Amino acid sequence: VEAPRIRITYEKIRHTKNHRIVSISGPSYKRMNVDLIDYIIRKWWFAGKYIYLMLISSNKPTYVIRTHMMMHGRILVGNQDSPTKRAFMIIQLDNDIVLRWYRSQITLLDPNCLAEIKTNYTICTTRQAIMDSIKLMKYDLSNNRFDYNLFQSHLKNGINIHSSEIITDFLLDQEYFPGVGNILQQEALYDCKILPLKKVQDIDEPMFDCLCNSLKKIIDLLYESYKFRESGKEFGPILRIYRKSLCPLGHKTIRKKIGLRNRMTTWCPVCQL
Ligand SMILES: [Zn+2]
Numbered sequence: 001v002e003a004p005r006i007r008i009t010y011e012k013i014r015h016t017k018n019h020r021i022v023s024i025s026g027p028s029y030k031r032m033n034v035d036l037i038d039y040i041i042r043k044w045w046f047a048g049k050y051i052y053l054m055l056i057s058s059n060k061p062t063y064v065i066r067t068h069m070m071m072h073g074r075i076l077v078g079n080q081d082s083p084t085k086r087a088f089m090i091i092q093l094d095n096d097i098v099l100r101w102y103r104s105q106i107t108l109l110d111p112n113c114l115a116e117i118k119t120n121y122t123i124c125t126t127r128q129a130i131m132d133s134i135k136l137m138k139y140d141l142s143n144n145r146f147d148y149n150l151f152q153s154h155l156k157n158g159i160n161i162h163s164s165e166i167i168t169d170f171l172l173d174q175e176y177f178p179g180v181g182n183i184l185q186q187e188a189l190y191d192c193k194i195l196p197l198k199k200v201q202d203i204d205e206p207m208f209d210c211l212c213n214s215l216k217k218i219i220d221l222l223y224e225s226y227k228f229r230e231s232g233k234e235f236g237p238i239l240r241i242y243r244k245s246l247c248p249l250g251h252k253t254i255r256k257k258i259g260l261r262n263r264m265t266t267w268c269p270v271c272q273l
Contacts, residue, residue, distance in 0.1 A: 002181025048178025121175035
């Protein structure tokens with residue numbers, strides 16, 4: 001799951017805000033080892049591949065639930081009737097709405113906790129992880145809080161730091177491209193005719209700008225495709241290189257795992273040089 005699916009999920013569930021938890025269950029809930037009955041949903045937000053849920057209750061500690069949706073991971077809105085099978089967590093609210101988590105990493109974050117944890121971009125305290133999420137929203141290409149100028153400045157630092165690694169590895173760095181996943185990175189690389197094996201240091205100013213524009217364009221297209229489906233329409237195909245045997249020009253493609261991340265990338269050796 002990658003952008004803009006995280007935003008889409010957020011937009012679908014955020015109107016559960018201000019409602020009370022009547023019942024809650026599932027293995028992922030038990031694992032957190034905290035009673036959340038009668039807590040109130042204060043706020044939802046998202047940053048990259050993380051969706052955050054703030055829960056409050058009078059005279060009780062505030063908690064944040066962090067969700068990382070894995071492959072075929074979803075948070076679904078339903079009711080008591082809906083099937084619960086295979087769901088990691090079930091939350092029923094006071095208005096009979098039921099939220100169901102599937103195939104997701106679910107973590108309790110205590111904002112007052114100073115224990116060190118590993119996130120998808122660093123190692124930091126639990127408290128710092130929550131604070132960082134607020135800052136990382138500005139770097140999320142699909143987020144409404146995206147800040148172009150701050151993103152560009154931030155990106156320039158990362159280009160200097162990760163100069164030695166291949167471009168695919170850098171495009172998947174969740175500190176600099178939060179929300180970007182395997183499909184986006186290779187679609188963008190083909191769109192800009194850049195070889196995935198090319199090092200970051202060997203990419204010039206206009207082409208990094210080119211990559212960022214391509215990434216945001218494809219995210220826009222994916223989001224627009226969702227908007228079409230919602231109204232009962234079909235937007236049409238938009239993928240050009242993902243799992244394709246032939247590039248749209250007709251060249252034979254190469255498909256293998258690359259980089260330290262070892263993610264499977266399809267590229268055209270002719271078009272992308
Ligand atoms: Zn080609």
